[PDB]
Amino acid sequence: MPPTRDELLCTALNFVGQFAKLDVESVLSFMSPSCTLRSFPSSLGKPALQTKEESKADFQGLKDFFYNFQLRVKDGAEPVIDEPARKVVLHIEGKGDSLVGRFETEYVYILQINEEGTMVEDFFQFADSATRDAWGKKIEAHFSARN
Amino acid sequence: PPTRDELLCTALNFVGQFAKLDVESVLSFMSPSCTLRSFPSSLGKPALQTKEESKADFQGLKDFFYNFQLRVKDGAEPVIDEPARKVVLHIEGKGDSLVGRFETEYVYILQINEEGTMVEDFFQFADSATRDAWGKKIEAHFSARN
Numbered sequence: 001m002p003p004t005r006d007e008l009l010c011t012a013l014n015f016v017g018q019f020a021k022l023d024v025e026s027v028l029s030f031m032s033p034s035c036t037l038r039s040f041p042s043s044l045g046k047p048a049l050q051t052k053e054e055s056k057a058d059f060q061g062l063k064d065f066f067y068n069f070q071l072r073v074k075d076g077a078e079p080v081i082d083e084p085a086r087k088v089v090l091h092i093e094g095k096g097d098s099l100v101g102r103f104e105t106e107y108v109y110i111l112q113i114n115e116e117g118t119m120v121e122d123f124f125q126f127a128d129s130a131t132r133d134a135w136g137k138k139i140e141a142h143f144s145a146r147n
Numbered sequence: 148p149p150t151r152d153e154l155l156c157t158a159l160n161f162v163g164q165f166a167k168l169d170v171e172s173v174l175s176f177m178s179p180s181c182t183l184r185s186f187p188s189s190l191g192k193p194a195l196q197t198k199e200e201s202k203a204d205f206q207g208l209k210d211f212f213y214n215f216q217l218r219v220k221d222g223a224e225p226v227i228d229e230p231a232r233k234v235v236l237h238i239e240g241k242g243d244s245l246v247g248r249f250e251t252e253y254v255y256i257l258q259i260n261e262e263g264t265m266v267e268d269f270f271q272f273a274d275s276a277t278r279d280a281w282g283k284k285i286e287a288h289f290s291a292r293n
Contacts, residue, residue, distance in 0.1 A: 040237070041252050041274035044286035080228045080235055080256060087226050089235045089256070091186070091272070106187045108254045108272050110226060110235065126237070126254045128187035129276035 003117035005083050012079070012088035012111045015120050019094075020070040024059045028052065032119040040126045065139060066103075069096030074106070086113045100138035105131040149263030151229050158225070158234035158257045161266050165217040165240075170205045174198065177266045186272040201269075212249070215242035220252060232259045232267075248293040249282040 003011070011030075018026040031037075037050040062069060071094050073079065080089035092107045105128045112122035149157075157176075164172040183201040185192035193200075208215065219225070223237035238253045251274045258268035276284050281292050 041276060043276065043284060046286075078231075080226065080231065080233050082226045082228055082235075085224070085226065089226055089228075091270075106272075124237075126272055128189050129274060130187065130189035131275075133276060 002083075002115065003086055003113055005081050007117045008081055008083065008086060008088050008113050009079055011113050011117055011119070012090065012109075013073070015111060016071045016073070016090065016092065016109070019062065020068070022063045022066055022069055024056065024063050027059050028056060030119055031055075031123065032114050032121045035120055036122050038122070038124045040124070041129055043129075065099045067097045067099075069094065069098075069103075086115070086117075087111065088113070098135070098139075100135070100142045103131070103135050105135070148229070148261070149232055149259060151227050153263045154227055154229065154232055154234050154259050155225055157259050157263055157265070158236060158255075159219070161257060162217050162219070162236065162238060162255070165208070166215055168209045168212055168215055170202060170209055173205055174202060177269065178260055181265070181267050181269060184268065184270045186270070187275050189275050190273060210245075212242040212244050215240065232261070232263075233257065234259070244282060247281045 015027070015030040018030055031052050033052060035052045037052070037055045038048060039046070039050065040048065042048055071092050074091045074093050077091035081087070088111045090109045090111070092109050093104070094107065095104045107128065108126040110124035111120050113119070114121045161173070161176045164176055177198055179198065181198050183196045183198070184194060185196070186194070188194065217238055217240050220237045220239045226235035227233070234257045236255045236257070238255050239250070240252065241250045243249075253274065254272040256270035257266050259265065260267045278284060283290070283292070
């Protein structure tokens, strides 16, 4: 039996809740081995697509640079669920206290769940590049100063 | 209720109106109650605005672009919540503008009315990367200005 609307939302929001653990592996453990990570908007030289293996560095950085961090569905933003496709669309806010101060960003996640309803097999994110890139610059200036 | 493909056709036709750069063709496929929700917050736009307030930004679009095209980005399957009458699309926008060649992209989430004919909620999440005076991203620092 295919996942129900409720089962799809459960797996998607369990995936989203793993980011706050800042432990690298809890997020990765909700991605199937063949999971495609897609990261938008497109930018020159940046790959749109990543393997699960390639994305582990990203979760390593979350751990290393944040005292705390949480992803949450924006209040009032009802999930959009394509039950046939096993897809959950979420308007997400990420907020945390980092090495270089407060970080508050947002995203659209589109999560495709596997047939079993247990893992994310396609992880689309559309990032708020203004805040992401600004924080990235602060991280670079911080490490450049530590030397 | 509106069908999957029925919601899809209405959504894609709404996206198709933007190239007209005439302000009114887009508004005419929105409902009088239709709201426009613009994200991310970093771009400084209201999280909520009226159809009337939005006519200003469509007039901006007309004045900014000589030509403009909105398309579903290649290979981006639409995401359709049939009971909610919502269509999620990954959109690319390209055109010749006052400051030159300009390209951007969005996620649209379009809620269609019960008749399956017009847009009742227009959610967009735009590319917020900083651009230089000619609309180019930092990675394009050395490319020709087109």
